[PDB]
Design an enzyme around this catalytic site. Sequence first.
Site, PDB file in Angstrom:
ATOM      1  N   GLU A 126       3.963 -34.155   1.470  1.00 41.24           N
ATOM      2  CA  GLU A 126       2.854 -33.683   0.652  1.00 41.24           C
ATOM      3  C   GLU A 126       3.342 -33.102  -0.668  1.00 41.24           C
ATOM      4  OE1 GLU A 126       2.838 -33.810   3.843  1.00 41.24           O
ATOM      5  OE2 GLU A 126       0.864 -33.470   4.712  1.00 41.24           O
ATOM      6  N   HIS A 161       0.803  -1.216   0.000  1.00 45.66           N
ATOM      7  CA  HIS A 161       0.000   0.000   0.000  1.00 45.66           C
ATOM      8  C   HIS A 161       0.837   1.268   0.000  1.00 45.66           C
ATOM      9  CE1 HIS A 161      -3.639  -2.309   1.894  1.00 45.66           C
ATOM     10  NE2 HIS A 161      -3.404  -2.648   0.640  1.00 45.66           N
ATOM     11  N   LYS A 164     -16.099  -8.624  -5.296  1.00 51.42           N
ATOM     12  CA  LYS A 164     -15.277  -9.578  -6.037  1.00 51.42           C
ATOM     13  C   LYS A 164     -14.562 -10.545  -5.099  1.00 51.42           C
ATOM     14  CE  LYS A 164     -13.071  -9.267 -10.526  1.00 51.42           C
ATOM     15  NZ  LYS A 164     -12.688  -8.297 -11.583  1.00 51.42           N
ATOM     16  N   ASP A 165     -14.051 -10.041  -3.972  1.00 49.72           N
ATOM     17  CA  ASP A 165     -13.416 -10.902  -2.986  1.00 49.72           C
ATOM     18  C   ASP A 165     -14.426 -11.780  -2.266  1.00 49.72           C
ATOM     19  OD1 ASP A 165     -10.744 -10.551  -3.328  1.00 49.72           O
ATOM     20  OD2 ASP A 165     -10.526  -8.977  -1.812  1.00 49.72           O
ATOM     21  N   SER A 172      -0.791  -1.084  -6.185  1.00 50.77           N
ATOM     22  CA  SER A 172      -0.759  -2.426  -6.740  1.00 50.77           C
ATOM     23  C   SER A 172      -0.527  -2.380  -8.248  1.00 50.77           C
ATOM     24  CB  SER A 172      -2.048  -3.172  -6.402  1.00 50.77           C
ATOM     25  OG  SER A 172      -3.159  -2.566  -7.025  1.00 50.77           O
TER      26      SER A 172
HETATM   27  C1  HEM Z   1       1.454 -15.881   3.376  1.00 47.30           C
HETATM   28  C2  HEM Z   1       0.768 -15.851   2.241  1.00 47.30           C
HETATM   29  C3  HEM Z   1       0.514 -14.565   1.573  1.00 47.30           C
HETATM   30  C4  HEM Z   1      -0.458 -13.677   1.887  1.00 47.30           C
HETATM   31  C5  HEM Z   1      -1.479 -13.803   2.985  1.00 47.30           C
HETATM   32  C6  HEM Z   1      -0.335 -12.597   0.988  1.00 47.30           C
HETATM   33  C7  HEM Z   1      -1.216 -11.524   1.065  1.00 47.30           C
HETATM   34  C8  HEM Z   1      -1.276 -10.594   0.060  1.00 47.30           C
HETATM   35  C9  HEM Z   1      -2.270  -9.620  -0.079  1.00 47.30           C
HETATM   36  C10 HEM Z   1      -3.444  -9.442   0.846  1.00 47.30           C
HETATM   37  C11 HEM Z   1      -1.970  -8.894  -1.185  1.00 47.30           C
HETATM   38  C12 HEM Z   1      -2.775  -7.740  -1.713  1.00 47.30           C
HETATM   39  C13 HEM Z   1      -3.922  -8.238  -2.600  1.00 47.30           C
HETATM   40  C14 HEM Z   1      -3.434  -8.701  -3.947  1.00 47.30           C
HETATM   41  O1  HEM Z   1      -2.743  -7.982  -4.623  1.00 47.30           O
HETATM   42  O2  HEM Z   1      -3.774  -9.914  -4.404  1.00 47.30           O
HETATM   43  C15 HEM Z   1      -0.779  -9.410  -1.740  1.00 47.30           C
HETATM   44  C16 HEM Z   1      -0.162  -8.903  -2.866  1.00 47.30           C
HETATM   45  C17 HEM Z   1       1.117  -9.287  -3.260  1.00 47.30           C
HETATM   46  N1  HEM Z   1       1.839 -10.301  -2.788  1.00 47.30           N
HETATM   47 FE1  HEM Z   1       1.259 -11.540  -1.328  1.00 47.30          FE
HETATM   48  N2  HEM Z   1       0.682 -12.801   0.136  1.00 47.30           N
HETATM   49  C18 HEM Z   1       1.247 -13.982   0.428  1.00 47.30           C
HETATM   50  C19 HEM Z   1       2.317 -14.620  -0.189  1.00 47.30           C
HETATM   51  C20 HEM Z   1       3.108 -13.950  -1.100  1.00 47.30           C
HETATM   52  C21 HEM Z   1       4.308 -14.427  -1.615  1.00 47.30           C
HETATM   53  C22 HEM Z   1       4.925 -15.750  -1.270  1.00 47.30           C
HETATM   54  C23 HEM Z   1       4.793 -13.470  -2.481  1.00 47.30           C
HETATM   55  C24 HEM Z   1       6.044 -13.538  -3.249  1.00 47.30           C
HETATM   56  C25 HEM Z   1       6.140 -14.315  -4.319  1.00 47.30           C
HETATM   57  C26 HEM Z   1       3.862 -12.399  -2.495  1.00 47.30           C
HETATM   58  C27 HEM Z   1       4.028 -11.262  -3.249  1.00 47.30           C
HETATM   59  C28 HEM Z   1       2.998 -10.349  -3.433  1.00 47.30           C
HETATM   60  C29 HEM Z   1       3.056  -9.273  -4.416  1.00 47.30           C
HETATM   61  C30 HEM Z   1       4.226  -9.021  -5.328  1.00 47.30           C
HETATM   62  C31 HEM Z   1       1.879  -8.614  -4.321  1.00 47.30           C
HETATM   63  C32 HEM Z   1       1.415  -7.400  -5.083  1.00 47.30           C
HETATM   64  C33 HEM Z   1       1.091  -7.629  -6.551  1.00 47.30           C
HETATM   65  C34 HEM Z   1      -0.081  -6.772  -6.931  1.00 47.30           C
HETATM   66  O3  HEM Z   1      -0.823  -6.203  -5.973  1.00 47.30           O
HETATM   67  O4  HEM Z   1      -0.351  -6.600  -8.094  1.00 47.30           O
HETATM   68  N3  HEM Z   1       2.836 -12.727  -1.641  1.00 47.30           N
HETATM   69  N4  HEM Z   1      -0.373 -10.457  -0.950  1.00 47.30           N
HETATM   70  C1  HEM Z   2      -1.895 -21.296  15.135  1.00 50.27           C
HETATM   71  C2  HEM Z   2      -2.752 -21.954  14.357  1.00 50.27           C
HETATM   72  C3  HEM Z   2      -2.686 -23.415  14.158  1.00 50.27           C
HETATM   73  C4  HEM Z   2      -2.894 -24.398  15.071  1.00 50.27           C
HETATM   74  C5  HEM Z   2      -3.233 -24.246  16.523  1.00 50.27           C
HETATM   75  C6  HEM Z   2      -2.735 -25.635  14.414  1.00 50.27           C
HETATM   76  C7  HEM Z   2      -2.892 -26.826  15.123  1.00 50.27           C
HETATM   77  C8  HEM Z   2      -2.793 -28.045  14.504  1.00 50.27           C
HETATM   78  C9  HEM Z   2      -2.982 -29.288  15.124  1.00 50.27           C
HETATM   79  C10 HEM Z   2      -3.326 -29.508  16.572  1.00 50.27           C
HETATM   80  C11 HEM Z   2      -2.801 -30.243  14.180  1.00 50.27           C
HETATM   81  C12 HEM Z   2      -2.895 -31.731  14.396  1.00 50.27           C
HETATM   82  C13 HEM Z   2      -4.326 -32.240  14.245  1.00 50.27           C
HETATM   83  C14 HEM Z   2      -4.495 -32.884  12.898  1.00 50.27           C
HETATM   84  O1  HEM Z   2      -4.276 -34.061  12.760  1.00 50.27           O
HETATM   85  O2  HEM Z   2      -4.897 -32.154  11.848  1.00 50.27           O
HETATM   86  C15 HEM Z   2      -2.492 -29.596  12.968  1.00 50.27           C
HETATM   87  C16 HEM Z   2      -2.250 -30.277  11.796  1.00 50.27           C
HETATM   88  C17 HEM Z   2      -1.867 -29.638  10.627  1.00 50.27           C
HETATM   89  N1  HEM Z   2      -1.748 -28.326  10.408  1.00 50.27           N
HETATM   90 FE1  HEM Z   2      -2.107 -26.889  11.765  1.00 50.27          FE
HETATM   91  N2  HEM Z   2      -2.437 -25.438  13.122  1.00 50.27           N
HETATM   92  C18 HEM Z   2      -2.392 -24.117  12.892  1.00 50.27           C
HETATM   93  C19 HEM Z   2      -2.118 -23.435  11.716  1.00 50.27           C
HETATM   94  C20 HEM Z   2      -1.752 -24.101  10.564  1.00 50.27           C
HETATM   95  C21 HEM Z   2      -1.371 -23.485   9.367  1.00 50.27           C
HETATM   96  C22 HEM Z   2      -1.304 -22.003   9.101  1.00 50.27           C
HETATM   97  C23 HEM Z   2      -1.095 -24.492   8.467  1.00 50.27           C
HETATM   98  C24 HEM Z   2      -0.660 -24.323   7.072  1.00 50.27           C
HETATM   99  C25 HEM Z   2       0.609 -24.039   6.794  1.00 50.27           C
HETATM  100  C26 HEM Z   2      -1.298 -25.729   9.130  1.00 50.27           C
HETATM  101  C27 HEM Z   2      -1.102 -26.936   8.513  1.00 50.27           C
HETATM  102  C28 HEM Z   2      -1.354 -28.141   9.152  1.00 50.27           C
HETATM  103  C29 HEM Z   2      -1.206 -29.437   8.488  1.00 50.27           C
HETATM  104  C30 HEM Z   2      -0.780 -29.686   7.068  1.00 50.27           C
HETATM  105  C31 HEM Z   2      -1.527 -30.366   9.402  1.00 50.27           C
HETATM  106  C32 HEM Z   2      -1.536 -31.855   9.197  1.00 50.27           C
HETATM  107  C33 HEM Z   2      -2.971 -32.302   8.924  1.00 50.27           C
HETATM  108  C34 HEM Z   2      -3.114 -33.750   9.295  1.00 50.27           C
HETATM  109  O3  HEM Z   2      -2.181 -34.499   9.145  1.00 50.27           O
HETATM  110  O4  HEM Z   2      -4.271 -34.205   9.793  1.00 50.27           O
HETATM  111  N3  HEM Z   2      -1.701 -25.460  10.420  1.00 50.27           N
HETATM  112  N4  HEM Z   2      -2.496 -28.239  13.189  1.00 50.27           N
END
Ligand code: HEM
Ligand code: HEM
Lengths: 48, 111, 52, 60, 102, 380
Positions: free
Chosen positions: F270, F200, F226-227, F204
Amino acid sequence: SEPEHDHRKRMGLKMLLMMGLLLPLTYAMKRHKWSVLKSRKLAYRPPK
Amino acid sequence: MYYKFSSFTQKLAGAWASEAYTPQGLKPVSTEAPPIIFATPTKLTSSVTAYDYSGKNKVPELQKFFQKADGVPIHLKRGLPDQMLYRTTMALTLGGTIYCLIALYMASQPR
Amino acid sequence: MLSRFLGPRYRELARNWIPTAGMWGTVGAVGLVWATDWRLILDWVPYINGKF
Amino acid sequence: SPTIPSRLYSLLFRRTSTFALTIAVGALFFERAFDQGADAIYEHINEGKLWKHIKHKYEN
Amino acid sequence: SSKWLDGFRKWYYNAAGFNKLGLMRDDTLHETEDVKEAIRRLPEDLYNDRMFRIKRALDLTMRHQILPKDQWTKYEEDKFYLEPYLKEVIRERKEREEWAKK
Amino acid sequence: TNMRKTHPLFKIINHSFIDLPAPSNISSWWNFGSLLGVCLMVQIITGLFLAMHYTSDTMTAFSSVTHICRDVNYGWLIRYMHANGASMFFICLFLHVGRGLYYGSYTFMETWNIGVLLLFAVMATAFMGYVLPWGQMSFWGATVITNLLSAIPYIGTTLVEWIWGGFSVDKATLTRFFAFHFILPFIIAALAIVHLLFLHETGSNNPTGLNSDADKIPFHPYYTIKDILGILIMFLILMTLVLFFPDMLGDPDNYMPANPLNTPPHIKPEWYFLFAYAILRSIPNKLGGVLALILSILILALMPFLHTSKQRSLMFRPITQILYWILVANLLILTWIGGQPVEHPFIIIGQLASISYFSIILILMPISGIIEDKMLKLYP
Ligand code: HEM
Ligand code: HEM
């Protein structure tokens, strides 16, 4: 292994009907608000 | 000098001698009226023919109705109902054709 | 210290805002009844007498 | 006698509070009607397979 | 093989796709600092024409449409208006850089 | 007088979501990042409702997971929603990254760097979360990944012992992985706030790559609705995936309890790790494979310095479009090879795919941009 199987399929049927109801309606509101802009006509008047 | 029809009120208001009685400028000539350019001009047409009533020996009113003045074919000339049943006709025959292709491909494959 | 809010204009404003506030209270009551499945209300509505 | 969207706008959809009241009442009735209809469909496909269809041969 | 290269250049110009949006080649340049300085030195009529072309292209991309084929920017009438301004900006920046080297 | 432009809490919401100027022509791909935020929020909520019954001890981890799926009311819905939401989160993340690569969005350098830090954080979070249910493939994938992380000379063995809390994966590893999997998504949320702030600051990007200042619209109601439509569609795929086929993206061998004595015939993570694992199988060197993994994630951060063109997006660069789709095709190939046995012909296919991957990102794309500049009469 799946005691929740029948309940999961019932919830899936309700989800399919529910999303089949609400995808066209949300698309209709989006097309409303964005058809404000999608029929916009722009023109240029340079003084030359 | 005294009154000019203005001020967004559809009424005469008080105006000056150079504004109510000389509304043209003291420039020598008019300069230019520049044109407006656009992407593509839209089509303008009206539709007020409507139709008539129906009954016994009401062939000549439909004879009047099917004189075109429209640039539309006769299979879309009635308006709504023939258009939608044409719409469904081509839709179901397209679905039947693609289901024929799928059926023939599955029939060609043995098990 | 709300003696500023004593007058005919504020009384007319409040009188205008009674029915909108009553309708919003009706919406809040129906929303709290529906989202909690209260047995004191849905057993009186004729159609919803199937889950109880 | 105009069309029924004119009636919906004139009586319900004009004020926002009445709009919220009608969508809450519709939420209640749509909840019950959709639940009953979707459940009836679910035993229509799964007729003779669920526990409530075979329950009468064991329950006393 | 000059005409082979030239016809291949016409084919690549038609295959890039910005002529279908009414855009020129100089509109499609990325606005870096040198390019922004080139836009800043433009005369106002060319600036207004460029801004209208960008606005028309964004409006066409919003609706996922293109211009009709007669309104496409032809290859012969594509004027490279930003080239002398950008050339002067690059020359001045390289002069400043070579002065900063010594 | 209005509270939208005056109240300091509502001022940030007004300047970030209501009256933020946005390009009028950004397509549906610009939904995906916003979807990612919702996905993160959904995961956190489901994760919280998984933390209320999960017991992080090795004797009562798999049993607690079965207690969630069998006795807790709609606990199966919460757990399988959490797993399939993680998978849909990586789907949105991959499409967000690929859209950033296609439309030249890496010129926002700080936003790109905060993004790749977020990518590292969510990959670590997913790996530890998959360790958490303590299945067979959970324990064995944890053991494999850490004992290949031990490949740094003179530092690696002490580091993997201190990560393990012992000689291998055991109860201390499970407890610390539960704590770390809990703590990481909040750091991810803070980094996402910094991500949005850095975006911001500069605005964008539009798909044409031009300047969108000539035609900008408020974010509300346009991209709000849209979102909302994108959120509804994402929920449609997510609920279809959880309510009809809960196991196309899972592994059956994780439904067995963790056995240190028994090793599985095939060990794989995975799918969102699998392509990287393929690169990890591409080089027959331990330290070289570890650096191949780390550079295979980090060359995305390197790509802002690989721009050799004077046009931003790929909308008017068709050769680089073809080469980009060849790159996405190579990524699909590596994803397929990563879940295959280590046997002919997958070795030479994986080596060719890794060579093509690093050649396309490092070598061929700047050359394609240079010759496109030459053909547009720009390069000397
Ligand atoms: C953790 C996961 C991510 C979240 C929650 C996230 C969140 C956001 C949000 C809310 C926006 C603004 C809305 C939009 O433009 O679509 C955005 C834009 C953007 N994000 Fe991410 N993002 C993530 C991962 C990434 C990653 C991994 C990259 C790098 C490859 C990235 C690069 C960008 C860029 C370059 C923009 C701006 C492009 C544009 O607005 O045209 N983001 N992201
Ligand atoms: C702070 C927030 C979160 C909590 C407390 C949490 C907690 C847990 C717990 C207790 C499990 C084991 C239960 C199960 O078998 O599914 C789990 C599994 C898992 N979580 Fe999270 N989680 C969180 C956020 C996330 C996020 C952001 C991701 C993504 C990157 C994620 C990816 C996973 C995956 C892939 C598994 C394995 C699923 C399975 O094998 O059943 N978690 N999480």
